[PDB]
Design an enzyme around this catalytic site. Structure first.
Site, mmCIF file in Angstrom:
data_model
loop_
_atom_site.group_PDB
_atom_site.id
_atom_site.type_symbol
_atom_site.label_atom_id
_atom_site.label_comp_id
_atom_site.label_asym_id
_atom_site.label_seq_id
_atom_site.Cartn_x
_atom_site.Cartn_y
_atom_site.Cartn_z
ATOM 1 N N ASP A 14 0.819 -1.210 0.000
ATOM 2 C CA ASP A 14 0.000 0.000 0.000
ATOM 3 C C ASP A 14 0.859 1.269 0.000
ATOM 4 O OD1 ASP A 14 -2.240 -1.780 0.341
ATOM 5 O OD2 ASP A 14 -1.866 -1.841 2.462
ATOM 6 N N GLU A 186 -11.436 0.247 -3.838
ATOM 7 C CA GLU A 186 -10.773 0.758 -2.620
ATOM 8 C C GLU A 186 -9.565 1.638 -2.991
ATOM 9 O OE1 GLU A 186 -9.496 -2.673 -0.325
ATOM 10 O OE2 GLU A 186 -8.450 -3.521 -2.030
#
Ligand SMILES: [Ca+2]
Ligand SMILES: [Ca+2]
Ligand SMILES: [Ca+2]
Lengths: 534, 534, 534
Positions: A14, A186
């Site tokens: 991420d 997302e």
């Protein structure tokens, strides 16, 4: 020259990339590992070094009892108004119909400084990201969770204004985007570039079906048009690519007016002579960070070299800055500061758990709870960052019960690990033994064939040799001659792809621990810790 | 007069009985339910009332994040030197090869008083118990845990002297007893009666194979000889007895010079026309507390009426004292002391979670995490204490998203519950809906056929009718006329015997909660809570 | 000399005992093993020998494709009108809501003769039994199966007249008995003794909950009164008894006017230091046959010495007759009749599968299907009849593909076995290898460490050493010096109690087989088969 992906190896998912004048930072998620949020630095996007973990105090981050792969999910690091802003998520429930979590904002003038007391935001979903618009306004975006059992959980992207002056979210929240038919929408980031707000999202889920898509709108509220050539990034369709699971991306505009896209990947172990579409791979190094060059076509970003993502990428036009290694291959524990590549589980270490002071040149660990505990483990570890390496240690420990053990451990989560330990047996006294857990199946494969330790040995040397698909432990009583212990482990079993449960989001570590079930807090003295990649 | 077992009904396991002059007290385990340790009081052993929960602040009991059926395991309550002593255990790991836990000691002049700051004991096993000898010495006994995977985990009983002067365990710990071939040797208590130290242990595990056995020694250290007639107490061999799972006992010598034995039991739902040896039963009321009369034969205690245990027992020679009920069948929430029969999960309730003051005559719950969270649930609940009862409430709530819900819930643990909720739908607005979780399989059986709630309805009445093997919810907009919701649930699914995992140690509750995943803390007002056993 | 139970060792369940003048016979069930129904003979009840398998041709017994533990369930052997009568059941579905099966009747003037073409009876349940009343009428009793998913499947016992004249069941079938609250009511036998018809039934299921109960009536039709003291026989309540699973009995009245009761038992492996109520045991010898004395009290039969059954039982007043062994410890395959202790799976062997004539002094097995096939295996095997023994063979085989293999096997069913094989590898030629299946999990533990066989070795000697809880294979190229292959197996995994699935009714075998997947039918010649207990 060339960027060589991955730029951030081992467990580093991420990536949130951030420019501060001519400095570049990537924040990555750390989940249950403390302290929270890895921040790496670069001048040139080619060379990186680990420099900070902002969330380093209980008041910022309290993860005692957090589930595996709960805690710090995708972080968002931005720089604006002369300071850094960090959005983070503490996830408390990692499976089922809900994903209970809480989002927070902290700030700091430097990434390695003391970050401010957190501001409470919302918890309607994870992947919160802070957008600073050029009119002085600020907005939080995050995914909005739908728990209803007959619906896909990823309801789209929610947007709400954030007020720095009032220290809160203000006004009404709005769903601004529902994603594509790939779903798992997302990782929202908004960039206002020229005449458009660009909404970047991850889709497909963080597995082999991972992607990033871009949509755009003339106004922040939408409606957003999806890129006709979506997705922007994915190697789902290419099972042979070196970089897999390409998604969860962030964009940077360098000071040299170039465009780069950081993103996570997985690098599978060799799959062997097996069906290439069925067996996409096992990734013991977890989700790593890679970076791609971006070019613009018709006002849409495009990945140079194809959406699958490339290993060898054109570097930006910036003079190189190389960095010294951030650890010694042999750490002799001669400093009162634990190396930045070491983390512990969930909570800040205290002098009652680990001390570099009690005994100069040693790390003393005072025994705590077992390898299965999500509370307090006297256990420090660092990431596997290569498929081939050696790690080792030596430990002085005098256990007088099987309830006491100290040793060297390869670890993914509380139900997936192996270890070689100095412990105690009724008939043989101090012995070396092997314990392991394979998706909550526990074994001690040596059974009665434990290895007795002579009374006059002070420091027992322990080693693991990781060799791509397998690894094996060895010991030595003199630090020169090593004996192999006959228990061979599969490296794929410490991978995101092998572990069971809703949370499979970290990667393999190797470290050292001390367990004392009795409550006597027996100390184990580790003289050093080596890690050498081949 | 007759003791009518069980004397403590619904979830009330591991009874530790204690005499102080002519007052009798039983402490039972509470696991994740807060505040910790139920204490009941009696004068006559027939009539019991709930009077205290000593572990009512974080400094005493911190279970945030604790697993289901972790936290407070069997407690030990004693009276000596003119004060009460409470030994307790906070279990952090409930399954696998370890059972990481911590034992503590606290004291108080009265059971309902403010208990002292805890003294740290050991963690070598659970079931810790404090023995006060007639020479002024004190000792802790507990079970000793063997994690080794090729061994039974129950290594025997450990003994160590405890020093009140030094506030710590002192000297060496010794295993004093290994148990019988029934194994699962736990719940140690020592009693020094006449010429012997008697060591009582629970064995067989707290299922249908549960028992209590007695061993005796002329010295506290052993060696202990086992009762040739062991066990003292068990109904394993008698699958038809009303009391099952008879074990984990404690012994009281009454002030009238009689001998009684408190122990836990389960009472199965009807098994119907099914093989009686195979299907031993499902116990939605969890493990409850009973008491047997003890007589002495050849210096061994024996259970009067047979070791299987009797459901009705001759009471001691003490005049009856009855107690007022401890709750109102209809609790109108007109007092700012939450009734003693309500507990919440894991942590102390604060005014930010629950308030009786914000609006007089109402319990206001400010929405927190979902029903699957081991962290912070705005949820208060009371035990099922009968196989047949109604419970109901009414709630004012204005949800504007499906991430908000408030209602009435039957609950065992985070993956075993059902609920009828006031919540919101995109198309119908405020609606009545059903959610359930069956060993982690979630369902919402109404699907689209949710019940719309008219905008002019202030309080929505919700009710559950529990009828032995099944239960069903209904709702009312006027408080008089009820409509059944067509989802019928099986009571056996909220029982120790049905729930999966290593921790299956509580019981069915019924309560009221408010969920708000958004982070907005939306309040739900409950006007009343009714509980009425038929 | 005492009857030393079990009298029939190794897999020998469902004993139907039958007297013919002064000869005694016991028929036991054989499930998928061919030829069907074992018959043992005795003069004195102390000494038994195996003498016949009636069901030895396809027209009597066709089990091609039958499921594991399908086929021949409990048989019923009687003697009336100067001939033997055999009721048998061919079960086709062993699990789920039905138990599809078919009952048949055959007859013969001697147990070892040529039995008559079968008469078709019914299919309403298994455990059919032929009762010959003293007025010349005959009746079939069996259990009646209820498939309904919300009911126990065991509906009770049905009665219907059987007509020898018409060769069929005549009149109406009637349910005559519903059984006790133990349920699993099965194994019905009727005996007309004095003024009563006694109905004996097995109850509890053929596990540790097994029992036998007796009921009686003045009429064959009922109503039957159940023995106040039921069960007649069971060790369920005594986990320490050497004989367990005591049930499925048949009663014999000797010519000396004494009464005995044959019944099945399981004899578990030592359970070690483990909870005795929880781990009742693993039985690799399957269900064996024992015999108890019966005495009469108030016209109810009773097991002499307690319901649990005794190991050493007083013999009847009949002079001893001992038998020769029925096999050679070392079988050199010099006879053209295969030994009676050898069976094969499901179907008759033909010359195309196995031959003793092709090469004198050898058994030639012509390769067929794998060890997982319910159709045609070239595999003959004999029962484990002790916890300690050696079995060995030697084999000449020239595989030229990994699709060909011949060797020695310990086998329970198609998904539970292990074997040491002579086979072939691309790089090493002929090799010895190990294959096993553990509840459908397959493994080849040697991997690349197979053992090369020299080109000049003609017969490869193969051995297994079974040593209570474990067993292990060895090989020898010279027939004198053996080497162990490093793969230790657990005997418990070849037991009724371990194997998964609805049919768990046979026991461990050891034998020799030849697999040729290619279809070329490659022959393997076995020079001998050795079985030696100690
Ligand atoms: Ca050092
Ligand atoms: Ca009220
Ligand atoms: Ca031969």
């Amino acid at each position: 020259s060339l960027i060589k992906n991955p730029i951030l190896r081992g467990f580093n998912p991420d990536p949130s990339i951030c420019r501060a004048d001519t400095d570049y930072y990537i924040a990555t998620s750390t989940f249950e590992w403390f302290p929270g949020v890895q921040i790496h630095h670069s001048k040139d996007l080619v060379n990186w070094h680990l420099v900070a973990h902002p969330l380093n105090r209980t008041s910022l981050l309290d993860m005692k009892g957090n589930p595996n792969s709960g805690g710090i999910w995708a972080p968002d690091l931005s720089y604006h108004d002369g300071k850094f802003w960090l959005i983070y998520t503490d996830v408390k429930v990692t499976d089922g119909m809900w994903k209970d979590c809480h989002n927070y904002l902290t700030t700091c003038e430097s990434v390695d400084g003391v970050w401010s007391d957190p501001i409470t935001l919302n918890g309607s979903g994870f992947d919160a990201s802070l957008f600073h618009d050029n009119d002085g306004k600020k907005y939080l975006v995050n995914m909005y969770w739908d728990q209803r059992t007959y619906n896909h959980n990823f309801y789209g992207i929610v947007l709400q204004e954030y007020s720095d002056k009032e220290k809160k979210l203000i006004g009404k929240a709005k769903i601004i985007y529902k994603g594509t038919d790939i779903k798992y929408t997302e990782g929202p980031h908004i960039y206002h570039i020229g005449d458009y707000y660009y909404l970047f999202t991850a889709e497909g889920g963080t597995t082999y079906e991972h992607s990033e898509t871009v949509a755009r709108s003339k106004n922040i509220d939408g409606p957003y048009e999806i890129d006709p050539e979506y997705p922007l990034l994915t190697s789902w369709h290419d099972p042979r690519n070196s970089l897999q699971k390409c998604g969860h991306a962030s964009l940077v505009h360098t000071h040299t007016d170039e465009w780069y896209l950081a993103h996570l990947v997985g690098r599978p172990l060799p799959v062997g002579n097996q069906p290439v579409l069925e067996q996409r791979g096992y990734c013991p190094l977890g989700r790593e960070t890679s970076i791609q060059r971006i070019e613009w076509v018709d006002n849409w970003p495009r990945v140079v070299g194809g959406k699958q993502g490339s290993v060898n990428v054109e570097a930006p036009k910036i003079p190189e800055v190389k960095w010294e290694k951030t650890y010694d291959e042999k750490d002799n524990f001669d400093s009162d500061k634990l190396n930045i590549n070491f983390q512990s589980l969930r909570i800040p270490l205290t002098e009652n758990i680990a001390s570099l002071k009690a005994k100069k040149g040693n790390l003393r660990l005072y025994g705590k709870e077992s390898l299965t505990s999500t509370f307090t483990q006297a256990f420090i570890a660092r990431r596997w960052q290569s498929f081939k390496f050696d790690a080792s240690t030596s430990v002085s420990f005098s256990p007088d019960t099987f309830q006491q053990a100290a040793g060297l451990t390869c670890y993914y989560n509380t139900e997936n690990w192996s270890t070689i330990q100095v412990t105690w047996n009724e008939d043989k006294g101090r012995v070396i033994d092997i314990v392991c857990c394979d998706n909550f199946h526990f074994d001690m494969p040596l059974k009665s064939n434990v290895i007795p330790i002579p009374k006059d040995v002070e420091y027992i040397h322990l080693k693991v040799e990781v060799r791509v698909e397998t690894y094996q432990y060895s010991y030595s009583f003199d630090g020169i001659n090593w004996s192999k212990v006959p228990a061979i482990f599969e490296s794929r079993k410490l991978s995101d792809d092998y572990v069971q449960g809703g949370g499979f989001f970290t990667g393999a570590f190797v470290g050292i621990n001390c367990i004392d079930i009795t409550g006597n807090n027996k100390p184990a003295d580790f003289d050093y810790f080596c890690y050498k990649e081949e």
